[PDB]
Amino acid sequence: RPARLDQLLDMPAAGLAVQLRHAWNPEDRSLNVFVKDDDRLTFHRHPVAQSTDGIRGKVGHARGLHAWQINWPARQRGTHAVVGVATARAPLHSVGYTALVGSDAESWGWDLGRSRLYHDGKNQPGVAYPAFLGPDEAFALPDSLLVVLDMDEGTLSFIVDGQYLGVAFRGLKGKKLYPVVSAVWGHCEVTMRYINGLDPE
Amino acid sequence: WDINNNX
Ligand SMILES: [Cl-]
């Protein structure tokens, strides 16, 4: 576990105003999702058939270390629940049911149902994550996970059950990366709670 | 290599 990750997580968690600044962006989304007015940290996906829909956080990170919590109820995932980061150019919708995040060079995602990492996924196969998993093996992840973006080292990592799962992706330095997810489940509600950020030393 | 074994 990196020393800086321990430093970020030992800090008191950021308050509501900071969480709202880093929440889902009602202006940067598929039209098939909306940000809930009574809980602006959560979006709701309309029950549209044969559609995959995403949304980005309001803040695109270009430097520093950042962590946010995703709460995605396990029975609201369906065939394709993907969590990760994207540039501003990543598409936020596809026809059909797809792992939209990680499907091209503009995003990096963890397909929760397959326990596979995708980046430029049309060209590159998925990577088993967590590491313990065999080639045809997946793990049923709990509702909550932490997403850790290190823009200075250029890495994305995850923490599940308080266990750091290691670097999932590298090569992110010099970009401007937003939290993102892609969803397919009718009426799913996914919450994102920014925890903290830490400037490089 | 999608969910339905199609790449
Ligand atoms: Cl797909």
CSV table of C-alpha atoms and ligand atoms in Angstrom, one decimal:
chain,number,residue,atom,x,y,z
A,1,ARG,CA,0.0,0.0,0.0
A,2,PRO,CA,1.5,3.4,-1.0
A,3,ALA,CA,2.5,5.8,1.9
A,4,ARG,CA,0.5,8.6,0.3
A,5,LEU,CA,-2.7,6.4,0.1
A,6,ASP,CA,-2.4,5.9,3.9
A,7,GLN,CA,-2.0,9.7,4.4
A,8,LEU,CA,-5.1,10.4,2.3
A,9,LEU,CA,-7.3,7.8,4.0
A,10,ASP,CA,-6.2,8.8,7.6
A,11,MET,CA,-7.5,12.4,6.9
A,12,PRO,CA,-11.1,13.1,8.2
A,13,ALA,CA,-13.4,12.5,5.2
A,14,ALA,CA,-14.4,15.6,3.2
A,15,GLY,CA,-17.7,17.3,4.1
A,16,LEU,CA,-20.9,17.6,2.0
A,17,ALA,CA,-20.0,20.8,0.1
A,18,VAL,CA,-16.8,19.1,-1.1
A,19,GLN,CA,-18.7,15.9,-1.9
A,20,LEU,CA,-21.2,17.9,-4.0
A,21,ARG,CA,-18.5,19.7,-5.9
A,22,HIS,CA,-17.1,16.2,-6.9
A,23,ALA,CA,-20.5,14.5,-7.4
A,24,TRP,CA,-22.1,13.3,-10.7
A,25,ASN,CA,-22.5,16.1,-13.2
A,26,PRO,CA,-26.1,16.6,-14.3
A,27,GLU,CA,-24.6,18.4,-17.4
A,28,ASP,CA,-22.4,15.5,-18.5
A,29,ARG,CA,-24.4,12.4,-18.8
A,30,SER,CA,-26.4,10.1,-21.1
A,31,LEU,CA,-30.0,11.5,-21.3
A,32,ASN,CA,-31.1,8.1,-19.8
A,33,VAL,CA,-29.7,8.9,-16.4
A,34,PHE,CA,-30.6,11.8,-14.1
A,35,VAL,CA,-29.0,13.1,-10.9
A,36,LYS,CA,-31.5,12.7,-8.0
A,37,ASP,CA,-32.6,16.2,-6.6
A,38,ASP,CA,-33.1,14.8,-3.1
A,39,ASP,CA,-29.6,13.1,-3.1
A,40,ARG,CA,-27.3,14.8,-5.5
A,41,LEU,CA,-24.6,12.3,-4.9
A,42,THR,CA,-26.7,9.6,-6.6
A,43,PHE,CA,-27.9,9.1,-10.2
A,44,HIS,CA,-30.9,7.0,-11.3
A,45,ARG,CA,-31.0,5.2,-14.7
A,46,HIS,CA,-34.3,5.2,-16.6
A,47,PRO,CA,-35.5,1.7,-17.6
A,48,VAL,CA,-34.5,2.0,-21.3
A,49,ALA,CA,-34.1,-1.3,-23.2
A,50,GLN,CA,-31.0,-2.2,-25.2
A,51,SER,CA,-29.0,0.8,-23.9
A,52,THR,CA,-25.8,1.4,-21.9
A,53,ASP,CA,-25.6,4.7,-20.1
A,54,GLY,CA,-22.9,6.6,-18.3
A,55,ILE,CA,-22.2,9.8,-16.5
A,56,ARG,CA,-19.1,11.7,-15.4
A,57,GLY,CA,-18.2,13.4,-12.1
A,58,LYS,CA,-18.0,17.2,-12.2
A,59,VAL,CA,-14.2,17.3,-11.6
A,60,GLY,CA,-11.6,16.2,-14.1
A,61,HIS,CA,-8.4,15.5,-12.2
A,62,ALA,CA,-5.0,16.4,-13.8
A,63,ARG,CA,-2.7,16.1,-10.7
A,64,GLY,CA,-2.7,14.8,-7.2
A,65,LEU,CA,-4.0,11.6,-5.5
A,66,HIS,CA,-7.8,11.2,-5.2
A,67,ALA,CA,-10.2,8.7,-3.7
A,68,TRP,CA,-14.0,8.4,-4.0
A,69,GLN,CA,-16.5,5.8,-2.8
A,70,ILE,CA,-18.9,4.2,-5.2
A,71,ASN,CA,-22.0,2.5,-3.7
A,72,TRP,CA,-23.7,0.4,-6.3
A,73,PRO,CA,-26.3,-2.1,-4.8
A,74,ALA,CA,-25.3,-5.5,-6.1
A,75,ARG,CA,-28.8,-6.5,-7.3
A,76,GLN,CA,-28.9,-3.3,-9.4
A,77,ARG,CA,-26.0,-4.2,-11.7
A,78,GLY,CA,-27.4,-6.4,-14.4
A,79,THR,CA,-25.1,-7.7,-17.1
A,80,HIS,CA,-22.7,-4.7,-17.3
A,81,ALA,CA,-21.7,-2.5,-14.3
A,82,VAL,CA,-18.4,-0.8,-15.0
A,83,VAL,CA,-16.6,1.7,-12.7
A,84,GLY,CA,-13.5,3.7,-13.5
A,85,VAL,CA,-12.3,7.0,-15.0
A,86,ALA,CA,-12.7,8.6,-18.4
A,87,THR,CA,-11.4,11.6,-20.4
A,88,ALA,CA,-14.0,14.2,-21.5
A,89,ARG,CA,-14.1,12.5,-24.9
A,90,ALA,CA,-15.3,9.1,-23.7
A,91,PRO,CA,-18.9,8.3,-25.1
A,92,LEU,CA,-21.6,8.1,-22.4
A,93,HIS,CA,-24.0,5.9,-24.3
A,94,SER,CA,-24.1,2.9,-26.5
A,95,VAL,CA,-26.9,1.0,-28.2
A,96,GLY,CA,-27.3,-2.5,-26.6
A,97,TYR,CA,-25.8,-3.8,-23.4
A,98,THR,CA,-22.0,-3.3,-23.3
A,99,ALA,CA,-19.1,-2.6,-20.9
A,100,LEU,CA,-19.0,1.0,-22.3
A,101,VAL,CA,-16.4,2.3,-19.8
A,102,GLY,CA,-13.0,0.8,-21.0
A,103,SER,CA,-14.3,-0.1,-24.5
A,104,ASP,CA,-12.0,2.4,-26.2
A,105,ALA,CA,-8.8,4.5,-25.5
A,106,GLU,CA,-10.8,7.2,-23.7
A,107,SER,CA,-11.7,5.2,-20.5
A,108,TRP,CA,-10.5,2.7,-18.0
A,109,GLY,CA,-12.9,0.5,-16.2
A,110,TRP,CA,-13.5,-2.4,-13.9
A,111,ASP,CA,-16.4,-4.6,-15.0
A,112,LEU,CA,-17.7,-5.6,-11.6
A,113,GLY,CA,-19.7,-8.6,-12.8
A,114,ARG,CA,-16.8,-10.2,-14.7
A,115,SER,CA,-14.1,-8.9,-12.2
A,116,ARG,CA,-12.2,-7.8,-15.4
A,117,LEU,CA,-10.3,-4.6,-16.2
A,118,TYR,CA,-10.8,-3.0,-19.6
A,119,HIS,CA,-9.0,-0.3,-21.4
A,120,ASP,CA,-9.2,-0.1,-25.2
A,121,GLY,CA,-11.3,-3.3,-24.7
A,122,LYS,CA,-12.2,-3.7,-28.4
A,123,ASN,CA,-8.4,-4.4,-29.0
A,124,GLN,CA,-7.1,-5.6,-25.6
A,125,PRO,CA,-8.6,-8.5,-23.5
A,126,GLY,CA,-9.8,-8.1,-20.0
A,127,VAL,CA,-7.5,-8.6,-17.0
A,128,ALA,CA,-8.6,-10.6,-13.9
A,129,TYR,CA,-8.8,-8.3,-10.9
A,130,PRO,CA,-8.5,-9.0,-8.0
A,131,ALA,CA,-5.2,-10.9,-8.8
A,132,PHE,CA,-6.2,-14.2,-7.1
A,133,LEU,CA,-8.8,-14.9,-9.8
A,134,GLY,CA,-8.4,-17.6,-12.4
A,135,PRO,CA,-9.0,-17.1,-16.2
A,136,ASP,CA,-12.7,-18.1,-16.2
A,137,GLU,CA,-13.2,-16.8,-12.6
A,138,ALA,CA,-15.2,-13.8,-11.2
A,139,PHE,CA,-15.8,-12.6,-7.7
A,140,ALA,CA,-19.2,-11.2,-6.4
A,141,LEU,CA,-18.2,-7.8,-5.1
A,142,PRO,CA,-20.0,-6.1,-2.3
A,143,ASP,CA,-22.0,-2.9,-2.7
A,144,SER,CA,-19.3,-0.5,-2.0
A,145,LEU,CA,-15.8,0.1,-3.4
A,146,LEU,CA,-13.2,2.9,-3.2
A,147,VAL,CA,-11.7,4.2,-6.4
A,148,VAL,CA,-8.1,5.7,-6.1
A,149,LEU,CA,-6.8,7.9,-8.9
A,150,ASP,CA,-3.1,8.9,-8.7
A,151,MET,CA,-2.6,11.5,-11.4
A,152,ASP,CA,1.0,12.1,-10.5
A,153,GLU,CA,2.1,8.5,-10.9
A,154,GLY,CA,-0.7,8.0,-13.5
A,155,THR,CA,-2.4,5.0,-11.9
A,156,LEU,CA,-5.9,3.8,-11.0
A,157,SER,CA,-6.4,1.3,-8.1
A,158,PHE,CA,-9.3,0.1,-6.0
A,159,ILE,CA,-10.0,-0.8,-2.4
A,160,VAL,CA,-12.7,-3.4,-1.5
A,161,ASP,CA,-13.6,-4.6,2.0
A,162,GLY,CA,-10.8,-2.3,3.2
A,163,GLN,CA,-8.3,-4.3,1.1
A,164,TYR,CA,-6.1,-2.5,-1.3
A,165,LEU,CA,-6.2,-4.5,-4.6
A,166,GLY,CA,-3.1,-3.0,-6.2
A,167,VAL,CA,-2.7,-0.9,-9.4
A,168,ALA,CA,-5.3,-1.7,-12.0
A,169,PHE,CA,-4.1,0.6,-14.7
A,170,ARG,CA,-1.0,2.8,-15.4
A,171,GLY,CA,-0.3,5.3,-18.2
A,172,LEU,CA,-2.7,8.0,-16.9
A,173,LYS,CA,-0.2,10.9,-16.3
A,174,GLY,CA,-0.8,14.1,-18.3
A,175,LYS,CA,-4.5,13.5,-18.8
A,176,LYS,CA,-7.6,15.1,-17.3
A,177,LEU,CA,-9.6,12.2,-15.9
A,178,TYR,CA,-13.2,12.2,-14.5
A,179,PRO,CA,-14.9,9.6,-12.3
A,180,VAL,CA,-17.2,7.6,-14.6
A,181,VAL,CA,-19.5,4.5,-14.6
A,182,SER,CA,-21.6,2.8,-17.2
A,183,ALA,CA,-24.8,1.0,-16.3
A,184,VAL,CA,-27.6,-1.1,-18.0
A,185,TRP,CA,-30.0,-1.8,-15.1
A,186,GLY,CA,-33.4,-0.3,-15.2
A,187,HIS,CA,-33.9,2.1,-12.2
A,188,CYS,CA,-30.4,1.4,-10.8
A,189,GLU,CA,-29.1,4.1,-8.4
A,190,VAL,CA,-25.3,4.6,-8.0
A,191,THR,CA,-23.9,6.9,-5.4
A,192,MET,CA,-20.4,8.6,-5.5
A,193,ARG,CA,-19.0,10.2,-2.3
A,194,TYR,CA,-15.6,11.9,-2.8
A,195,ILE,CA,-13.4,11.1,0.2
A,196,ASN,CA,-10.3,13.4,-0.2
A,197,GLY,CA,-7.5,14.6,-2.5
A,198,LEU,CA,-3.8,15.1,-1.8
A,199,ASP,CA,-1.4,17.4,-3.8
A,200,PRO,CA,1.9,15.9,-5.0
A,201,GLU,CA,4.9,16.6,-2.6
B,1,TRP,CA,-14.3,-11.3,-25.6
B,2,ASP,CA,-17.6,-9.6,-24.5
B,3,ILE,CA,-19.9,-11.2,-21.9
B,4,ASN,CA,-21.3,-13.6,-24.6
B,5,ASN,CA,-17.9,-14.7,-26.0
B,6,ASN,CA,-18.2,-12.4,-29.1
B,7,UNK,CA,-13.8,-11.0,-29.4
C,1,CL,CL,-19.2,-5.2,-24.4
